[PDB]
Design a protein around this ligand. Structure first.
Ligand SMILES: [Zn+2]
Ligand SMILES: [Zn+2]
Lengths: 473, 422, 145, 48
């Protein structure tokens, strides 16, 4: 921790070396002059502009906006628009030909991310409308249109491998390269909206994005079903899972500025019926993998293996797992087609549970679905769709935080977060329970109302430090 | 490496180690019950090996009490430090007490901290070593830059910060919880020396159980009132004893008939310490333990001396003093009682109450296990610290900005989610 | 079973009169008042056990001579120094005196331990008789109330 | 009784405002607010 902020200040010091000397503007000017250009010129600018920011340096984020408003340069945004019209798709046509370009584009939007991360709600609104200038250029609309043509291509790459299903290295290296396209650009569309300026939320609500996000689900379903099939396809799967993570990060962030039966919540329920089909996979696909960790180490696989090391045969798996009466036989085949079928028929519990990675994603999905319910209930469109995902939320109700805060909209909203297994477990037992009972009495006995919520964290910071102790013990 | 890792065993096992100390000493009660005289002596009926088990247990129990405190020294002690280094450092920022405010001669707990700030290590266990820099960058433009930087700043024998460690153990000593166990160790030490004082350990039954710490707390609850009250009884009794001295000295005869070397109570020290032994504690007063008045001019005057001593002293002043403990006990349990009510009546955070959430069946339990459920606000606040500020959500980053500011309006006042809506 | 033994021995036969307790509604309550707060009580009485044991040790070590049940010492002078007997002295005598130990013992009359006996005594009287009895007394009454 | 009459007074200064009588609760809506209503708004010495 303490090593990092001093390093963060080293970061910020090397950034300070620059932008105090007007380096901030040189980025902002060069791009503005390079109107439609995606020359190497522009590629060098952005990797500088990223390096100026890198971490949400607000001074720059201030100074970047200063040059835009003072010298009202409508050309800048006009230039950025033309970028995104160009940047890249993946491709499919030349991929046929390469059987016998993104680095600019990734870092384009990482630049744009860092323009906003730190939640500059002034700047995030500035990218909407560009108030002082003459012609408005909505970046946020256009980055959706970039993500839209991202989507269709990501879609198009699946269908080429919808049949072969042992995806080439040229397929992997081309597509994992495309994974980092979208993963980054979703993160913009977080950090455009993540600062909950609802102007930016409504602007994007009526935009096409939903049709992308629908279609990514069509990707993410049908990929994962066949990315599972190999022990070589996992590396791209780890990326595609990780994109699926950051994709749902996005519309969680879209849902945070929500009244209970709010329209932005309506849209999110609207898509889940239009794309009900494919989610049926990924909900089961998690139940394929969440029930898995809860059985293969439960009671009669750690006692049923004669080894103790973690080695069990295929037939030993299929006769025991199917007898547990959790899921059906077509998925036992699916998992055994997924597993390894290793050395003859055997399989390790390690690597087979390593494809545990899905619990990160499906948390957020379960968060999503819970937040849709707890914001927008009493819609059987959702209820039926939710009750299928029951098995998922059953895994995460231990692990999902749920609080209330009054998060600046003067209504109290509800916030979800990740409860760790280590921190949950440490909380209950040792002395912390003896420390809380000690706390709860001290509050009600002598607490003023200002002092009560102030004494709260005064416990909690200790109680952070409790588990920092009691777990290292 | 064997020292640290074994020390990790003690902190895990402290509460069983401390409960076992009560289990052991309870047998030391059972065995000290078997003494007699001859010079001191131990009779062992029904067994011959039980006195060497006292030789076992005395060594056993003491060094257990040594292994508990050295397990306690890393169990809660650093948290105590954590609390104390927290207390200072927020007040260095927000108050600037050693910059500006200079705390009073009372609360040496404040003034104990003057030493530690010059040390290099100062916020060891606070996870925030940047505080010492941040105070320089807040106040050093105003008052002194390198004046405040002057204020702030084999291999084992020269590695440690001495000025820190002197401060630290000072704060360790001022802990009630440590110093109890410290005082518990010293009673164990003297048991290895003399086995008599060894069973005074049984007052772990007081601070052990929660209902018996309260009763001795009930003694010092209202203690500020008590001592002034007992002082009253001191005085009142001294007033009677002077009247007795001047008017009624003859009535005091401890002896038989006067034909014996007639012991009488007229010296003022002895006469005053008569009534605190006799007159306070008689329960019937002086007029139980004295010559009944039988035919004097001062016969009547003795009675009027007496009943007055009995209504004022025995009936009023004892029983008040008696009461003022009981009343404190009655208060104190009632303060315990209300807390248990308060957790069930109102929500701890949003404060609303039981009634609003009984509209939904089984609803107040949901408001206590889903909506607010205290540990989550703990865990959320971990979650803020566990992630980076880049990755924070707009809700989170708000809160984090609330938090670093310490402005606290993020909690639900009363307008929790159910109340906010329909 | 109490009725059975009355056909055997007519003495235990009238222990049936504790039907007056559970019979009437206001007298079941009073014995309920005993065990209402019983979980608290036993821990409290245990306190009094301990405190009294603390005084009895001090008495054992510092003040053994003061105990003489007998007449003058010329009789076969019965004294209380054995620890079993000395501890069961104060629960019989020191708890139940209502005036404390210092009612039923040699009044201190000229020792080095004269003063020290008194300070032993009043402390025994505020802590034990005044506080710890009456609390225990109270804790039933409070339960009854 | 008498201590309870002493007790209630100490409560009454902290519960309600001495002059305007309203109470603690209305001024806890603003943080640190009852102390402001006792040190700025009414603050007995001023009416003196
Ligand atoms: Zn609440
Ligand atoms: Zn007023």
């Amino acid at each position: 921790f303490e090593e990092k902020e001093m390093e963060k200040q080293k970061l910020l010091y090397q950034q300070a070396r620059l932008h105090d000397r007007g380096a901030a503007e040189m980025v902002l000017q060069t791009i503005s002059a390079s109107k439609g250009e995606t020359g190497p010129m522009v590629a060098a600018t952005l990797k500088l502009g990223i390096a100026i920011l890198n971490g949400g340096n607000s001074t720059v984020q201030q100074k970047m906006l200063e040059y835009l408003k003072e010298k009202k340069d409508v050309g800048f945004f006009q230039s950025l628009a033309g970028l995104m019209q160009s940047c890249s798709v993946l491709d499919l046509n030349a991929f046929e030909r390469q059987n016998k370009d993104d680095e600019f584009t990734c870092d384009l939007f990482r630049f744009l991310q860092l323009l906003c991360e730190g939640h500059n709600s002034d700047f995030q609104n500035y990218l909407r409308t560009q108030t002082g200038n003459n012609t408005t250029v909505n970046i946020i609309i256009s980055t959706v249109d970039y993500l839209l043509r991202v989507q269709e291509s990501i879609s198009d790459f699946y269908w080429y491998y919808s049949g072969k299903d042992v995806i080439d290295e040229q397929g992997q290296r081309n597509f994992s390269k495309a994974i980092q396209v979208a993963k980054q650009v979703f993160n913009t569309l977080t950090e455009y909206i993540q600062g909950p300026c609802t102007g930016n939320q409504q602007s994007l609500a009526h935009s096409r994005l939903w049709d992308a996000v629908v279609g990514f689900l069509h990707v993410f379903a049908h990929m994962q079903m066949k990315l599972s099939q190999d022990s070589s396809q996992i590396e791209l799967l780890k990326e595609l899972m990780d994109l699926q993570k950051d994709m749902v990060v996005m519309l969680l962030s879209m849902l945070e500025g929500n009244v209970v039966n709010g329209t932005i919540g309506k849209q999110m329920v609207d898509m889940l019926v239009e794309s009900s089909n494919n989610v049926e996979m990924i909900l089961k696909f998690f139940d394929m993998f969440l029930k898995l960790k809860d059985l293969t180490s439960s009671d009669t696989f750690k006692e049923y293996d004669p080894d103790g090391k973690g080695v069990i045969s295929k037939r030993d798996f299929h006769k025991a797992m199917e007898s547990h009466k959790h899921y059906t036989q077509s998925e036992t085949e699916f998992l055994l087609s997924c597993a390894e079928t290793d050395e003859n028929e055997t399989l390790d519990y390690e690597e087979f549970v390593k494809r545990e990675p899905a619990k990160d994603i499906g948390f957020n999905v379960a968060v999503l679905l819970t937040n849709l319910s707890e914001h927008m209930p009493n819609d059987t469109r959702l209820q039926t769709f939710l009750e299928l995902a029951e098995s998922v939320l059953n895994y995460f109700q231990p692990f999902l935080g749920r609080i209330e805060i009054m998060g600046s909209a003067k209504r109290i909203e509800r916030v979800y977060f990740e409860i760790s297994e280590s921190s949950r477990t440490q909380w209950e037992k040792p002395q912390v329970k003896e420390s809380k009972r000690q706390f709860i009495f001290d509050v009600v006995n002598e607490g003023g109302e200002k002092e009560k919520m102030e004494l709260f964290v005064n416990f909690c910071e200790d109680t952070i430090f409790e588990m920092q102790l009691a777990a290292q013990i | 490496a064997y020292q640290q890792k074994l020390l990790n065993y003690f902190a895990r096992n402290f509460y069983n180690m401390r409960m076992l100390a009560l289990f052991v000493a309870f047998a030391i009660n059972f065995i000290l019950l078997f003494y007699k005289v001859s010079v001191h002596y131990v009779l062992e009926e029904s067994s011959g090996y039980m006195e060497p088990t006292l030789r076992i247990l005395a060594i056993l129990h003491t060094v257990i009490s040594f292994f508990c405190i050295i397990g306690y020294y890393c169990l809660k002690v650093p948290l105590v430090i954590f609390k104390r280094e927290k207390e200072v450092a927020r007040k260095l920022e927000f108050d600037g007490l050693y910059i500006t405010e200079q705390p009073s001669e009372d609360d040496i707990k404040g003034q104990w901290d003057r030493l530690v700030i010059n040390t290099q290590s100062f916020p060891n266990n606070y996870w925030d070593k940047f505080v010492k820099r941040k105070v320089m960058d807040k106040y050093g433009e105003f008052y002194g830059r390198d004046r405040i930087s002057e204020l702030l700043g084999s291999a084992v024998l020269n590695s440690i910060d001495v000025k820190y460690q002197m401060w630290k153990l000072g704060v360790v000593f001022t802990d009630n919880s440590f110093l109890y166990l410290a005082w518990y160790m010293t009673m164990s030490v003297l048991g290895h020396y003399n086995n008599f004082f060894f069973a005074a350990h049984l007052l772990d039954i007081a601070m052990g159980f929660k209902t018996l710490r309260t009763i001795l707390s009930s003694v010092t609850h209202n203690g500020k009132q008590l001592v002034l009250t007992v002082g009253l009884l001191a005085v009142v009794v001294y007033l009677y004893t002077v009247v007795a001295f001047n008017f009624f000295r003859k009535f005091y005869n401890k002896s038989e008939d006067g034909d014996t070397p007639d012991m009488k109570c007229d010296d003022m020290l002895t006469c005053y310490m008569f009534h605190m032994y006799v007159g306070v504690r008689a329960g019937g007063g002086i007029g139980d333990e004295i010559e009944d008045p039988a035919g004097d001019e001062y016969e009547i005057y003795r009675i009027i001396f007496d009943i007055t001593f009995f209504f004022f002293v025995i009936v009023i002043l004892l029983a008040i003093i008696q009461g003022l403990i009981i009343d404190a006990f009655g208060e104190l349990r009632d303060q315990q009682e209300q807390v248990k009510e308060d957790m069930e009546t109102k929500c701890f955070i949003c404060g609303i109450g039981n009634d609003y959430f009984d509209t939904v069946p089984h609803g107040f339990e949901t408001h206590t296990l889903q909506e607010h459920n205290l540990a989550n606000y703990l865990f959320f606040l971990m979650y803020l610290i566990n992630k980076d500020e880049t990755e924070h959500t707009g809700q989170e980053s708000y809160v984090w900005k609330m938090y670093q500011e310490r402005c606290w309006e993020f909690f639900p006042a009363g307008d929790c989610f159910r109340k906010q809506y329909e």
